[PDB]
Amino acid sequence: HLYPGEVCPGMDIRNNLTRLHELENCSVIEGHLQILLMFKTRPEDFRDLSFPKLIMITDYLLLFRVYGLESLKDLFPNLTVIRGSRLFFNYALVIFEMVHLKELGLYNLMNITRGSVRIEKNNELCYLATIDWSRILDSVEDNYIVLNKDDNEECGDICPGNCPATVINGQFVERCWTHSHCQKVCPTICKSHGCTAEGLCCHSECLGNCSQPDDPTKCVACRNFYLDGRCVETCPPPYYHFQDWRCVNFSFCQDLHHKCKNSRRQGCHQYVIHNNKCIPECPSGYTMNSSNLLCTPCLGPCPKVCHLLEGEKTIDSVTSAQELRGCTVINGSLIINIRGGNNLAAELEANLGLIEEISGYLKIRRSYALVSLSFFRKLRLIRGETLEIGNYSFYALDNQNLRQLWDWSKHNLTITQGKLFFHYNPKLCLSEIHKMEEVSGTKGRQERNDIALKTNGDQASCENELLKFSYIRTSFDKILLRWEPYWPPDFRDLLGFMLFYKEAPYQNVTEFSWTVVDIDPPLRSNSQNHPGWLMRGLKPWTQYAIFVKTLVTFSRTYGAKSDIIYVQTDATNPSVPLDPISVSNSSSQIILKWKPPSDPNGNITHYLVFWERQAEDSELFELDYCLKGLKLPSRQILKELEESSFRKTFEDYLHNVVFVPREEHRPFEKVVNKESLVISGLRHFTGYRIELQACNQDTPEERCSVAAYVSARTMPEAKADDIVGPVTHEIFENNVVHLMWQEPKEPNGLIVLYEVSYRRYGDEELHLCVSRKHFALERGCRLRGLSPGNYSVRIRATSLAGNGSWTEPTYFYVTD
Amino acid sequence: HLYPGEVCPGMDIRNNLTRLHELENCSVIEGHLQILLMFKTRPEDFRDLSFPKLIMITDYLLLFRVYGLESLKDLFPNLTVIRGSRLFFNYALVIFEMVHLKELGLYNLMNITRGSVRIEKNNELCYLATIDWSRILDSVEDNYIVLNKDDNEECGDICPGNCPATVINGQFVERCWTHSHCQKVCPTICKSHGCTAEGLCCHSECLGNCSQPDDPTKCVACRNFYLDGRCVETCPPPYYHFQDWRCVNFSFCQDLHHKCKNSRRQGCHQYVIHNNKCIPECPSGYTMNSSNLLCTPCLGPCPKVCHLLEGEKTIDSVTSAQELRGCTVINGSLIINIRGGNNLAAELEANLGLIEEISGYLKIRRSYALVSLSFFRKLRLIRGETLEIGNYSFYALDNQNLRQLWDWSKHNLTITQGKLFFHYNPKLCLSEIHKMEEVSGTKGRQERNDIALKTNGDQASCENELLKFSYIRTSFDKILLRWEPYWPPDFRDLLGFMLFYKEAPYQNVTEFSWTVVDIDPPLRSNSQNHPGWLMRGLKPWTQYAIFVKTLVTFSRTYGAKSDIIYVQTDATNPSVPLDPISVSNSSSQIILKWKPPSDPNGNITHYLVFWERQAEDSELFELDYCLKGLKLPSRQILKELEESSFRKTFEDYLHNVVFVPREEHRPFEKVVNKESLVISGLRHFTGYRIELQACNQDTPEERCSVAAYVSARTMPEAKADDIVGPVTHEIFENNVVHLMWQEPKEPNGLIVLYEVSYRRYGDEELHLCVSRKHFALERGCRLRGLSPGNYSVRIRATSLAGNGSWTEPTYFYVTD
Amino acid sequence: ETLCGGELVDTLQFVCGDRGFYFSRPARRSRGIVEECCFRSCDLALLETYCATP
Amino acid sequence: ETLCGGELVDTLQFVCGDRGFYFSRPARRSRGIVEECCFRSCDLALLETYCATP
Amino acid sequence: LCGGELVDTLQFVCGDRGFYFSVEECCFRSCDLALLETYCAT
Amino acid sequence: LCGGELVDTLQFVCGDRGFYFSVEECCFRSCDLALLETYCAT
Structure with a gap:
């Protein structure tokens, strides 16, 4: 929609709210708005004032000590865009010493064309960190927001969000203006062209907001220019651009120039025309022509002088430099202090640089x-x-x-x-x-102590004397260094070289951590000897950044440095694979896990892992497990600088005075590109010795690490410990029962003992130990002294895993 | 003895040894000796030259690049004392670039009156660290001996020593000149008066060496003056002092002055007389009188002008300043560069200061x-x-x-x-x-950049604005700080105070470790609020040095500091006494050792130590020790600075623009002043629980540490476990032997079991366990089934300590 | 006694009081307020002259 | 080419050679040897003039 | 330092004056003594 | 570093040239490579 209302060029309101009524009919402001210095005001006096008509601010908005104001959501409910043609100390919106302010309330701000925002020393304002300046400004880093209530205190930023949220550093956060409104965020396909509430993209020329999408006739602020509501990017003649935001007919500019001419206002400018632009004054090379307001090029090189008050000017801000924009000859002096x-x-280049x-x-x-x-x-x-x-x-x-x-x-x-x-x-x-x-050309116009040698470039390596490296080669663990000799005009002034070295992850490293070592200056060769230096200790296969810098006493300084040269250490033998853990889940499946060594020191080509079979412990066979105690396992410098100088100055005195003018094949597998391994085909309830080691080089001889030893044991089978075969018994004349049973040829490790329980009808259960020697020397068990009758015999096999299942009751009848 | 020979005033020998024959008759030299610049010489040419007559050198001795010389022990075997009246670059003996020298050889050097010694860049000389310059010079610290063979190499200083030795830093070392001679060191009662070989003190006036002790007539060098051999401290008239080493008659000085007057030698001086001194020229205030050579005081204040060549003079050494000695008005400029x-x-004060x-x-x-x-x-x-x-x-x-x-x-x-x-x-x-x-008085004669503010005193605390401390008091563990507020003329320039604190062992600490903490500037009180600060962490009862320094931006600098105030933290509860160890040596004596706690935190008044009696373990009574398994125990900033300045500079801009002009009683003892204790009266083979703790305060309530628990066990007696009393036995009808024996009421802890061994004639030995329950329920032992005959019965008591002695064989006869 | 930014405003509106500060137009003089009262000591009249009506 | 202390002596006794260096008496000129060959470049004649006989 | 343990600090900086509870100022941020003096009110 | 273990350094700084033994210069002092180059002689 158009801008119905007087343009009302920028003004300031001070000392009474009765002066705030000049904006009763204002859709635009061709200037700056300053509301400041309000002392005899109360919040009850602000609930009535509202300016829905205000849309666009050309220069800037400044608020400074307006007591009683708590929120601008009732003051400027339609402030859409701030042009920022001229700033206030390179700031397009200044909110300073804003006492009693609580929330910003500018929920209709969309874009700021040029400038920044500085809000500080409010002591009461929050709802600041819950905003997204990226979609508002163009250079967020130029902002300055400190000393508010947000940092020193903890005013809760409670707001709907519902409302859109976005990331800023590493986390999402809702972007809300006040407790009832939030920043309007819509897809990036409309970078600045605007977008409606639903999400439809506005016209390309439009900016910030629009009513009918893709229709410049119903826009609220269009970036390029303005005319008769239906703005266009560049108006055709006879309309000339005015103040970089709108264009008008030639009559308007002509009558404005006439008004400034006849009314000798000290601030008015004799506006001219130059390339369809009613600018206050065209630049150097044109002359103000009485007949036609346009300034034709002159037949002479007359520059545009820039007269300065009191012959001086301090450039400390963008607005300070903007006063010199278009000037080319300064009739004074410039003092830049930023x-x-x-x-x-x-x-600065935009404003200056034309002088x-x-x-x-x-x-x-x-x-x-x-x-x-x-x-x-x-x-x-x-x-x-x-x-x-x-x-x-x-x-x-x-x-x-x-x-x-x-x-x-x-x-x-x-x-x-x-x-x-x-x-x-x-x-x-x-x-x-x-x-x-x-x-x-002022070479002969210099004196002592006008260009200090020890202050300029004291922390900048710029002696601009280059040093080469003769030859270098890095070995298995260390590196040797050597470079060409250097000598100042007076060789006594060289106190040795400074060597700098650090680990550079990537190919680029900053110039001037940074561990250093002292180098003794080489003896005067007067064949020349290269100084060189041997390093001590490093982390192999790392990109090392090395350069050397000479250290010469100040007498002119003639030091030297070398280019940052990157030297790559070779590779080595890896360490033990970290955290070797082996777990068994199935009868033949054992899963072993490991991590790459802390220092790989080499591209790990494969892992050489061996699993080995062991025999049962020798002492286990010779240990009886029926004796009581049968717990079978369930298996500072300035002085040095002067000392060189003091030594030097004595020799000079001496010379002046004296001289006067006239394998076991354990099954293995090359685990490639895997920090784990699963092995199959393993005997039940049998341990394994695992030798784990890693290699990082295969084709040019196997460069392999040291072995790592871990122990793995498999779980047993289901019915491996049960005794199979008939229980044959031999009965002698003394009723001696000699039991026959076939041992479990494939047991759970080994069966240590046997438990035989024979019970007669009405009798009780007896027990007897059958050890390995008992089962061997007697070829089984040998029962003696059994009462007459039929006994129900059960045999239990005790293996390493535990006690086997009771055998089925076997009945044998002895004579009564 | 006298000095027989020509005084032969100082000269130099160069370019050939044929010029070294001028010293054929020389006992003293009234000048300087310079032997230097020898290139076409060999050591074979030095074995013949010797000067035993040379005794005393007035000015200095200098040797510079004399090839072929290996030792001066054959050149100057009698160089006793060097006066050092005029030095060579504040050095009385210079040995520079002395190639081929091996040992100094000056085994007759005793004293050097004034000057120092600089020997360097010899590359071959050793036997240097085996000398004592303290007895030779008067200021050893002014020496300069580097870059010799002694440091970079390891030339063995093998020498007799036999020869005297002395300490230098922390160890003794022999002081030898060469491989055959050593420095003569004799008791300090003769500080410089000299001393003979035996040890007798020479005459007081004598210096260095003498032949007959306490006889100036037979001296070799006497400190004060000289005349006719028998020197005296000050010769009477008509003898006037000459060159501060001897005096002669007036005729000698008069004829010397006449010789210099008539023979216009450019180096001769018109010697005058002033206070019995034939000096080259008397100082300001006297006039050279043609009649009598003495210069009478003048009737006018005419100073002694000091004309300078090319109107300049560089003062870089003592000899440079000595040329101006006696001068009072300089007709030129002085450039001091030391x-x-x-x-x-x-x-410098001796020579200068009269100008x-x-x-x-x-x-x-x-x-x-x-x-x-x-x-x-x-x-x-x-x-x-x-x-x-x-x-x-x-x-x-x-x-x-x-x-x-x-x-x-x-x-x-x-x-x-x-x-x-x-x-x-x-x-x-x-x-x-x-x-x-x-x-x-040149106040109005100053310009910018003539006195740099940021270079002078940059590391010297000298803002000379003192700050007081309001009130401070240190509590049990921490300390609170508070001081009066300070404000520069512009309060925005105060960026907060710097607080420095460190532990000061003794009452004196250097001004400007030194841990620092940042202080936020206090709010503008415009009642005034003291800034103050609270410390965090410290070591109690330590002398702490604290002072505060303001930190104000450079705009004039108006900072402030406080005096170094020492605050003493109070005392606290001590720690556990370190290393609690207890050892027992006798039946009732237990010795317990301990160390004072790492942090005493208090003057340890006494140690409160408790020893407590315990009962035998409850489970021990209920455990049987004859069952198998009977193992009984054998019991960086600039950004922050600018951010303050940037915030300030915007505030100034805003103001300018806007405003416009019109207890269980365990026995205990208070161990006082002892880190150990011996306790007596303890039961045999009984353990003890020792509760060790320390207290550092008694009268104002016992401030005591925490307890420390250690265990102590005593060794048993000799015959405590042996069973006493007759072995009574009751025999029943079944020949059941019921043994009666009285238990050892005071055993070694407790008797667990008994061993009874009864053996018949021709039979064997039997055993039986008698447990505590067996001894209680049966009231002893109860033997059953004994074969007929007389048995020899022995009883062994098994206690906690071990098995007791076998009882004497007891015989009892049962019916056959 | 010298007064600088921050407290200068509180010093104002009290020495002036009631009435505000006059303002015609920008019409820099480089001698506005800072180099009058902050850098150098300034008296009561130098603040009174910044009032509106008197 | 500039030569300074240390090597200046070795340069001498070779340019001069055979004969030594003359010496009459001290009779400072502030321009002895250092500011002739060390600070600034010096030629063969400036060393030859320090000989004894020629 | 945090609650319960931190009472000695206000006893140190306030003496026999007493204080009201609130730990959020030095359990996470730093005790600079600025809040501690104002925590105890006469 | 000291004898036996030190041989790799002279092999490093001398290559296929060989060397003669002497450790007193680096077991107690520092290896500045100055002596190491001269230790192996062509």
Whole structure:
């Protein structure tokens, strides 16, 4: 839908709510809105005010100490988009010292075209962490939200969610504006074109919200431009773009220019026309033509001067730099001082970089986020007419991240008067400063203590003297190092090389953990001897990043370093497979588990595992298990630097004074690409000795680890211990019963004893031990002294597993 | 003895040994000896040269690259004492690049009056660590002996020793000069007066060596002065002291002055007389009088000017400063640069400090050992006519230990032109520099970047703003801290306090281990709230050194610190006495040993130890010990700094834009002052439960530790288990023998069983178990079925300790 | 006594009180409030001059 | 090519050779040997001028 | 440190003044003594 | 490191060149590779 209402260019409301009635008919604001400094107000005075008509804010919204305000959900229920044409300290929405605020309430905010949001020192506001700024802004990292109620306190963010949720780091979370409304999140197929409540994509030109999808006529905010409600991406003539958000007929711009001309308002601009744009003033190369408002190109190279108040300007924010947008010649001096933490290269290049000549000096002080001065795209000459105090034209102080000053493969520079000045630039180096001096042409305009040697690049390896490595080769466990010798002009100043080495997982490692070792300088060969060094201890088959750096006393500094060279250690014999556990589930199936060794030290080609058969313990055969006690098992430096310098300075004194001018085949299997194994075909109730070992190399000889010993025992069968065969008995003249029974040739390990229970009708049960020797020497049992009658005989076989089943009652009749 | 021979003033021998014959008649040298630069020489050319006459060297001895020399024991066999009047780079004996030297050989060196010894880069000399420089020099720490054969190699210092030996750090070692001679060490009663071979003390005036003890007439070198052999401490007139080692008649000095006057030698001095001293020139305030050689005081304040070549002079050694000795006005500039490691304050004050005015500038660069500029005792005015490059009059660069500049309670200063310059003085602070500026009077002569704020005193706590502690009290385990609040002029710059605490064994601890903890700045009270802090974890009863230091951003710096306040934690309950071991040696004596607890936490007043009696184990009575199995027991930050600064700089921008101008009694004993105890009166073969615990406080309630339980068992008696009383037996009709015997009422613990062995004549021995129940229910033993005849009965009692002695064979006759 | 950001606002609206702070138009002077009262000591008149009606 | 202490002596007695180094008397010039060959490059004549006879 | 065991800290920092219960401030976060002084009220 | 075990290091730094025995330089001191290269002579 269209915007019915006065555009009402931006204004500010202060000191009384009676001034808030100017927005009674306002759908758009061609300016900035500032509601701030409210002291004699109460929350009871805010329940009535509401502005459903407000849709779009061009510049920014600022709220500062408005007492009695608890939520904006009743103030701006239709704030859709903020253009952010001009920001307030590179912030498009500032909420500062917002006492009594509880929830933001801006449940209709969709997009912020340019800028960031800074909300802090509210002490009462929550419902902040439950929002998704990614769908709202374009650079979340530029936000600044601290010192609210959210962090120091624990105001519960209770809200429906129902409402959409999304991940931010590693977990999902509902995105809600207030306790009744939540952020409108819809599929990414409509990146910024808008989307209705159901989910239909709005028109491509549309932005934020729309009523009828795919219909620009019924939109609420369209990104490109605006005209007569039915906005289009670019309006045709005779409509000229105005303030980058709408276009109007030539008559409007002409009468606005006439109004500013006849009414000498100090803030009005003589608007001109340049490429269908009613801009306040066209850039350099055009002249304001009295006949037609358009400014035709001039027949002369006259630049657009940029006069500065009191000949100075501090660039500390995007809005500070935007005042110089379109300017090309500065009639003053520039002092760049960006106390930040977020880089501003893009916006600085957008606003600056079109300037060519600076009348005064250029000074960069205390700037932090600046990584380079490359945003001065067309900086050519620095006249230095207004010389800086101390007679300087260039400045640099406490720049923590000034890496590169300019790209001198193509760039040009010229300084007329003054001298350079560099101090405390840990990321800037003397090579770039000397290039500055050479290119500028002020070589003979330098003095002592203007470019400190020990402050610039103190933590940046930039001596730009390269060192080669002669030959290196890594052996089975260790590595040897060797490099070409280096010598400064005075060989006594070399105190030895610094060697840096660390384990680099991937091919890229940062330059300047990082364990170091001291190297004694080599003897003066005056055949030349390579210094070299032998390492001590390492973890094999790892990518090691190594480079060497010389260490020379400061007298000029002429050190040297080498490129980061990656050396790969070879492979070795693996360790024991971790956690060897074997479990048996079936009569012939034993499952053994293991983990790869802690240090594989080699691509494990196969596992060589052996299972071996053992005989029963020798002492078991010679132990009787009917004797009582028959428990059968159920089987600091500066001094060193000076000492070199003190030694050196004595020799210089001495020379000056003196000289005056005139296999067992255990079954095995090569387990390949498996940390486990299942073995079949094993005897019942028989133990196994398992020899486990791993190999990581097969074709070029088997490089195998050490053996690991584990014990595995199988469960027995069902009816293996039961005695089979008839129970034959021999009766002598003395009624001696000599029992015959065939032993279980395949028992559960071995049968230790036998239990015979013969009971007569009305008698009781007797017992007798039949040991291995008893079963051997007597060839079974030998019963003596049995009372007359028929006995019911049962025999129990006692094996290693346990007592076997009672045999069926056998009846034998002796004479009465 | 006297010195027979020409004094032969100091000279140097170079390029041929044929020039070494000038010392054919020389007992003393009034100068320096330099033997150096010998290339075409061989050791075969040195076996003949010997100078037994040389005794005394005035200035110094220097040897530099004399090829073929292996030992000086044949060159200077009588070098007794070296005066060291003028040194060679503050060294009285330099041996540099001494190739082919093996042993020093100066076995006759006794004393060196002033200077030090530097021997280095010989690569062949050993027999160095086997010497005692303490008895030779006066300041051993000023020596410099490195890069010899002694350290990098292992030349055996085999020598007699026989010869005297002495300690140096913690062990004795023989002090030998060569393989045949050793350092002469004699009792300290003769500190430097000398001592003969036997041990008799020489004359007090004598020095080093003497022939007849307590006789100056027969001395070889006397410390004070010399005349006609029989030297005296101070010669009377008409003898005037000459060169601080001898005195001569006035005629000698007069003719020497006349010889220098008529013969215009460039190096000769017009010697004068001043206080019986034929000095080269008397100091300021006297005039050279043509009539009498003495210089009478003048009627005018004319100082002694000190003209300098090329208007500059570098002071880097004692010999460099000695050229200015006696001077008071310098017609040039002074550049002090002492590359050292040993302080030179004493000698600099001796030579310098008599100067008052400096025509040019004073510059101190790279000096290390200088802790203060106080040696300029009478420095008053610095004219600065010859201004330093850059228009400076005072300089300071890379002074690693410049603590104090001057004592401004009394000192005065005046600078005419130029400006101060201070850079990289970590031990110097801005307070002293501002005092410099105030006292000098050049306050309006300062510019930016002449006194760096972040380099001077960067590691010296000198903000000189004191902080008090409100109240503190330490409890049983922990300590609470509280101090008065502090606020810089801009309260936003305070980022919180730094708290430092460490354990200080003794009352003195160094200022600026040292564990630290961050303190959040207190809320703006605008009643004032004290910040305070609570500690976490400590070791009780320890002297803790605590102080707090503020941390304020660099915008001027207005931090604050507190005095080092020592707080003593109270005492606590001790731990278990370490290593509780108890050993028994006698029947009633048990010795228990223990160590004091690892943390006593209290002065151990006494030890409360209890020994308790126990009963025999209940299951022992119910266990039979004749059953098989009878085993009876034989009983990084910069981001945080900027975040505060970034938050501050946005607040300033907002304000500028918005506002616009118009108990069981177990026997116990309090073991006092003893880590052991011996207890008496204990029952034989009876165990003891020992409850060991310690107390460190008695009168104000017994603060006692936890109990420690140990077990102690006593050895038995001799004949306690033997059965006493007659072996009465009752015989029934069935020949049942019922044995009666009285049990050992006081046994070794308890008798478990009895062994009875009755044997008839020609029969064998029988056995029977008599258990506790068997002995109780049957009231002894009950034998059944004994064959007719007389049996020899023996009874063995089996107790806890073991089997008792066999009873005497008892005979009883049953009917046949 | 010097006063800086944060407490400067509370000092205001009390020295001024009742009436607010005047505002015509932006029309930087580089001498707004910080270098008047925070960096250097400032008196009562320098705060009174920022009122609206008087 | 610049030569400094240590090796300067070995360079001497070879460029000079045979004859030694002259010596009359101390008679500092602050320009003896170090600031001639160590700090800055020096030629053969600057070493030849330190001989004795020629 | 946590509940029950932590009472000695408020007894330390408050003396004979007493306190009301609340552990959530130092069982998970850190006891900085800032909350402890205000926990006991005169 | 000491004798017997140390031989691998001279084999490492000397290759197929061989060496003569002497351990007193690395069992108590440190192996800086300076002596090891000179220990094996061509």
